[PDB]
Amino acid sequence: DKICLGHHAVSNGTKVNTLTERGVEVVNATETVERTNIPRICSKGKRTVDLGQCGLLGTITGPPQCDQFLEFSADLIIERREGSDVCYPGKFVNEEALRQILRESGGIDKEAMGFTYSGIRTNGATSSCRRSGSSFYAEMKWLLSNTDNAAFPQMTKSYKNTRKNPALIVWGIHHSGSTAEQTKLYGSGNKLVTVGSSNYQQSFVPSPGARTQVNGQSGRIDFHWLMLNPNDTVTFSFNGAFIAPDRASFLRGKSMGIQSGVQVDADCEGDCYYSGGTIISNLPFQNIDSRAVGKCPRYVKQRSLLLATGMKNVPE
Amino acid sequence: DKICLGHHAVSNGTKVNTLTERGVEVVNATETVERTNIPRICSKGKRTVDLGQCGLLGTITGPPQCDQFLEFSADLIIERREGSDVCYPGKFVNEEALRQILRESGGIDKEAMGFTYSGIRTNGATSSCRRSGSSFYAEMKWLLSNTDNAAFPQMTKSYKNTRKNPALIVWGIHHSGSTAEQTKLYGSGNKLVTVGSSNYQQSFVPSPGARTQVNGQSGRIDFHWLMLNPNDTVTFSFNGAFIAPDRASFLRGKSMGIQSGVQVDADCEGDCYYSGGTIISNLPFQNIDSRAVGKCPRYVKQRSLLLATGMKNVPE
Amino acid sequence: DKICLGHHAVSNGTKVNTLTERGVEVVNATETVERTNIPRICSKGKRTVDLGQCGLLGTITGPPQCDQFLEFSADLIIERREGSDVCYPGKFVNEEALRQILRESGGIDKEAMGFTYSGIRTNGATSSCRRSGSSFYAEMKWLLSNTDNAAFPQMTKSYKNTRKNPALIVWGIHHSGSTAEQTKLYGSGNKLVTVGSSNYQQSFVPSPGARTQVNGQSGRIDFHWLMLNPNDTVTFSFNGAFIAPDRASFLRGKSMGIQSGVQVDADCEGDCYYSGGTIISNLPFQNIDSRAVGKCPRYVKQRSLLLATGMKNVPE
Amino acid sequence: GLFGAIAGFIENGWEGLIDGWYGFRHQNAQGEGTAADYKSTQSAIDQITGKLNRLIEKTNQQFELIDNEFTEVEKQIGNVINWTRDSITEVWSYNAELLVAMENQHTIDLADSEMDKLYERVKRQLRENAEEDGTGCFEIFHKCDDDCMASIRNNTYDHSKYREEAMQNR
Amino acid sequence: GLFGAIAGFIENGWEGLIDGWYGFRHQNAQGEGTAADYKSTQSAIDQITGKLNRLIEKTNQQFELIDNEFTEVEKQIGNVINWTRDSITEVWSYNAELLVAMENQHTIDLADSEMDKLYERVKRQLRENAEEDGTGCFEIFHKCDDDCMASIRNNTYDHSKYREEAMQNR
Amino acid sequence: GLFGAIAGFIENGWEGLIDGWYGFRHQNAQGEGTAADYKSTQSAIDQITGKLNRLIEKTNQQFELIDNEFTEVEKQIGNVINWTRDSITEVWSYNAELLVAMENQHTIDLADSEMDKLYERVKRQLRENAEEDGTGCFEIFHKCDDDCMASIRNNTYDHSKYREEAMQNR
């Protein structure tokens, strides 16, 4: 006698939001904001380098921590908190800029600049850089006066990059802990280290003076860098306090650097990384880490945003 | 015989916009973009500090303008245009960075570094810093040669922060108006002021030479700063042109700094601030000041955007 | 006997996208993302300056490339790749900042600072700056010792801007290729060039040393600048290695600078520019160049986004 | 609107309807009356308020100064800051413009449908006893006193009672 | 579409309807004709144009260079600039994608409803004289010459004139 | 919803309808049955999936580090970076909030209309043989065995066969 038209319903629908109403119940909804972690670096498919004890900038100068990686090749570069760019205390000028370049470098291929030093000591070392007792950076040369207080003969060096990609040159200025040891290592009188090329144009003067005892030393080493163009030619004029380089660095290809505190995993595949692991999701948004890198869901403040996949629920 | 279905209408509806049409008349609409000001700083609920004559950076070095605030405590810090960080002419290196730190510092608690100076004058002063006649910065010491032209004995000072929060250290380099008065104050020969710690690593040389007569003086004072870590230790090596500090600064808690030219008001409650007062609104957008700070409506270009709260209006 | 209600349809509708479906066919659609170029700089209505060989920063110092534009007036400033800010090798400190100021300057009106030099040579020149043989920058003076090795009398110069807009002052520090030629030009002993005013506060020391042979020269010229306020007064203290200015620059009005490699065109009207020409469109979005300048459509990743202008197409 | 009610068959609105948003207007033996429907009026109001509560939004996000009004920052960093802010102002100016135009479009269409719904509901009540005038009214083919009208308005009208008679007036 | 007209009861569209967007197609004694409805065609067109005018938008906001193409800026400030621009390109690429998909969804639904409206309007005219075929047509239970069809199309059709006869053909 | 079906005339939903989203429930001589309509169920499902495919979106845009977690960058450049990211997080937090609330509003209204469409379709089939109960059901004025019900459900019901009889039960 009668026929009816109807729609399904449930006893326990889920609440979602609309333009018009808050918490209106629907049949079925799905999550749109991701919160699910993976406490490892999903590295499957990518050639990964875990720097560990080694600081990223240290792969260019080569302290003992980084002997492992003096010429690394990577798709995925991982920095660790215990990493140090240094054995003998010192900073890098424009450190974070250089850090950002190396993260995408793909790795570094080194090449000898071929400097020859006459009339001076060349084999400077320190108890801070330990291999078999005292040593120094593996890529640098601690140019020293031939003996104590002996004058440092004003020298000039040169190096022309002949490759198709530009060359990362890195040198250092040694600041002594006193005027006493400064002359003891480079002779008396003022010192100057000027550096020239096409692009670059600057100069440097050491600053002897007492400091805190960082790693047993009072002195510091100011590491500076520049990018040398194809066909261009660096020029190092100096007469002391100069930490000469032996090798210039070249960028291999393309990579992506992250900073994490969780173990690697060559079994899971990943694309979005952060300090706490990998975010593998199909959802458009995430609420895990705003500083996530790679190809990631968009970071949003909300913990949850539910997209209805069913109709308005009207129970029986 | 007949019954009708109908909706209300008015003679004077208000025009709004849609996806499909411009200026379609509806019954009632409400404003969505805020333009209403409040020509005062609504400070009720917050502990406010009006710096007035005092410049924010001056609270660390303490010129006469800032004797009032050498150890202020604030939730809301207010800078004024007539503020000056200086009595004896000079700038701050990385000024705006330090300004940004102090705005959220919550205030500053000072602590003596305890330096003792032998064989030299210590009580340098100037007609620029006026308290009872000539004076100087309340937090700094104008180290001077014991007499005119007498050599300045190469000194070294030290200070270890032992608190759980890091310590803001501030020193200054005095640049004289001539080589004549430079030696007259620090003796002849070159001068160097190097500063060392864990993080920091740099050095400074005075630059004597004639300049404009700013505040009666030809000379300037280069104010530099650094952040000293827990357990770390600053070290000041010098032999002239050094404006030593007496006290290190420590950040109290959390605050928020603004820049305004309107009077305070501890009677009204506020959250969004700008140069012209306070924006107290429920509306999602504002068209007052793009550089508004605090918790504010989003700035938009439009003067007005009307959200319809009634139906399409069809008059009789 | 019967009457029907119907809508039009076509055999070949166009596919568009919706919230619910991908590639649903409609009657007529229009393009919303622009891809159409114009391989010229549409300059009609605007007074345009094509710098060509001249580098933008060179209009202030005036190398031979820029004699053309020492006092240009423009609404639209165009930089070219072959442009050079320099004849005698050297950089500009804070170059891109100064470049950004000049792009909107509207042009530059110069005014003599009126310095008079006694006891020294003034007419320094070089084979690098060629007009009728060796010459120099048209706005600068290469102050030279009266003869070879003769001491450079410690001098001081001054200049007060008296106009209502601030004055762009530009000077240079000459770094010699050796200590031999340095003294040969400015006498022996150290050199210092300090610069003072109200705002500004710094100093400079030359850096003699060997470099690459850029444009025949080993030496370089460090160009520095500052903004001199109304009523303020620059002060130049020096005793060598100083490239004094003859004229201060003043900004005319308002302009907009671009960088392009396509010819100008005073026949077409334009507003959105990029390296490859002009984007003249009514569409809200473009997919040509993300770095487009002026009043432009918003840059989007997509090559095409079709907005339906007809109904859902149901063929017969 | 998308539902053909407002600015459609109902040729216009009633300026006399101050009681509520929607209402009835009948004409019978005893004369003519006009009374508003609370239920539908409230339905539309509740949905407009629902738009209001969600759009009167407060962010707990605090932004501080990166500029300086009294001492201008360095030119390059200042231009990046000015460029960033300008690009974001453009975004919120767009979002606000779109948001309002979209909600307004929805609000109109919403109230438009609430009217139509009500018209459909009365239509289901009368069943066979009335017919559509084409202007939003029903021509009742029986006699409808004020209590009869009220029974329609308050949803208690029984159509069987008048079915035989109303159908008779074919 | 959300209104069941286009791709619904009207099984399809008419490629022969070049006169306008919507139209009538009748079959009677004198034969069969097809003529478009200007009023509804214009209504839909005006709303699509309204979308066009608002979406062909010009911002008076001028953006200048913060980059340099010929002499690369400093690496750190350049990476921040590149990062900022990339994050904003992502925003406008999203906005554009959503805007179009949303308007397209609205455009389809809009034209869908304008057809349905018209179908409902003719239905209100004929009242008791016709019945729904279920395919978007009305079966008229009287005789409808070309002038009768025209009276329906131009909204002047009187149903009382044919009421007695049409109801008689029960 | 905007179409008055769900939470409208159909006073509620059927928890017993596990077969599909929409369905029929009839009561006749042989008793009462309940069977779902595949065609309409799939229509709604396909449109919800269409929302899913487009919203499960992957950007090929790669973002790298401009910050540093282990060695904090310079205060000024760090504050600009922190300010930029915060302003963009605010934008995507808004976009996400709006996107979902908008799609949810559309999803409800969509399923609401698919039901109404189906109700209108059955109404077109029965023509003169039935009348609206006002609760989403049709009162058939002839006798409808299970095969008769099935013919309505599978769209093969002929109304002429029962027209004379159904109209007779006026």
Ligand SMILES: CC(=O)N[C@@H]1[C@@H](O)[C@H](O[C@@H]2O[C@H](CO)[C@H](O)[C@H](O[C@]3(C(=O)O)C[C@H](O)[C@@H](NC(C)=O)[C@H]([C@H](O)[C@H](O)CO)O3)[C@H]2O)[C@@H](CO)O[C@H]1O
């Ligand atoms: C307690 C205090 O403040 N005294 C410091 C003192 O720390 C510092 O002495 C240094 O002590 C460390 C071990 O703690 C080493 O023995 C340093 O010796 C070496 C070094 O290994 O670095 C020896 C090495 O042969 C030297 N290499 C060369 C090439 O000369 C280096 C080098 O000369 C200097 O490190 C360069 O600054 O030193 C030892 O110096 C002294 C340093 O002068 O300062 C006191 O104030």
Ligand SMILES: CC(=O)N[C@@H]1[C@@H](O)[C@H](O[C@@H]2O[C@H](CO)[C@H](O)[C@H](O[C@]3(C(=O)O)C[C@H](O)[C@@H](NC(C)=O)[C@H]([C@H](O)[C@H](O)CO)O3)[C@H]2O)[C@@H](CO)O[C@H]1O
């Ligand atoms: C007209 C001109 O260009 N002459 C300047 C001249 O301005 C400047 O002289 C200074 O004049 C002011 C008052 O206008 C003071 O009298 C300065 O004296 C003091 C000072 O108060 O600053 C005296 C004070 O006792 C000194 N304090 C100490 C610790 O020495 C200071 C201090 O020596 C210097 O200010 C440090 O630069 O000076 C007076 O100098 C002179 C300055 O040399 O330069 C002319 O060219």
Ligand SMILES: CC(=O)N[C@@H]1[C@@H](O)[C@H](O[C@@H]2O[C@H](CO)[C@H](O)[C@H](O[C@]3(C(=O)O)C[C@H](O)[C@@H](NC(C)=O)[C@H]([C@H](O)[C@H](O)CO)O3)[C@H]2O)[C@@H](CO)O[C@H]1O
């Ligand atoms: C092969 C090599 O490395 N030798 C360099 C050599 O290049 C350089 O010599 C310079 O050569 C150029 C032409 O190639 C000019 O002749 C330079 O002479 C001038 C100049 O024109 O610049 C002459 C001019 O009269 C001088 N002007 C003044 C005011 O003095 C300038 C000026 O002194 C210097 O350019 C300033 O640095 O020089 C000529 O110098 C020499 C430079 O010392 O260095 C060799 O190592």
Ligand SMILES: *[C@@H]1O[C@H](CO)[C@@H](O)[C@H](O)[C@H]1NC(C)=O
């Ligand atoms: C940034 O913009 C403000 C106005 O919004 C202006 O006053 C200021 O000068 C600008 N800063 C720079 C460096 O252009």
Ligand SMILES: *[C@@H]1O[C@H](CO)[C@@H](O)[C@H](O)[C@H]1NC(C)=O
């Ligand atoms: C910024 O991006 C452009 C391409 O969009 C690239 O050419 C340039 O090198 C980038 N700058 C830096 C510093 O990475």
Ligand SMILES: *[C@@H]1O[C@H](CO)[C@@H](O)[C@H](O)[C@H]1NC(C)=O
């Ligand atoms: C930037 O934000 C992070 C947290 O998001 C904070 O740890 C860091 O200190 C901030 N940097 C600066 C310079 O304020």
